[PDB]
Structure 1
Amino acid sequence: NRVDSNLGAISSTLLVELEGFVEQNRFQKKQAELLAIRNEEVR
């Protein structure tokens, strides 16, 4: 779980979602912390 519920959900994310595309920039802030957060626990 702790080493493969992360690393099979870190590889399950979808960074870019669905001009105004700057919201995508804002969106791609958020999930960044996600992967960083998850990675720390596996480390």
Structure 2
Amino acid sequence: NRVDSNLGAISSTLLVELEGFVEQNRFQKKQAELLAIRNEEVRRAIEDLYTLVRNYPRENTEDVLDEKEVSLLVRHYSKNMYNAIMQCTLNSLQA
């Protein structure tokens, strides 16, 4: 939900709606904050996910540290799925 009810609604938006077209400018202010708002929580959410996986007793983990580079891969998948959002929104818009 927190990482894919956002990122399947961020890619569901429609920026330009239906001279006076300056209202569109005003309209495209509003939803901008929308995506920004949503993005922050996902940058929050994935982040919080890491803390959950780290802070836990598991007595057979206090001699084996968690690795790093695949957590950077989890982070990277989060980035690229943001990108897939925005390119879907822009292409639907231009259509």
TM-score (norm 1): 0.95
Aligned pair count reads 42
Write out per-residue CA displacement over residues 15-42 of structure 1, whole angstroms, 9 at most, x where no aligned residue: 000000000000000000000000000x
How far did 1:8 drift?
Answer: 0.0
RMSD: 4.4
Higher helix share: 2
Alpha-carbon distance in 2 for matches of 1:20, 1:28: 14
SS of equivalent residue, structure 1 residue 8: coil
- For 1:2 and 1:25, locate their aligned partners in 2 and report how far apart those are by CA, in whole Å: 30
Q: In 1, distance between residues paired with 2:22 and 2:15? A: 14
The structural deviation recorded for 1:10 is: 0.0
TM-score (norm 2): 0.43
**Is the partner of 1:4 in helix, strand or coil?**
coil
Stretches of structure 2 lacking an aligned partner (at least 5 in a row): 42-94
Regions of 4+ moved over 2 Å: none
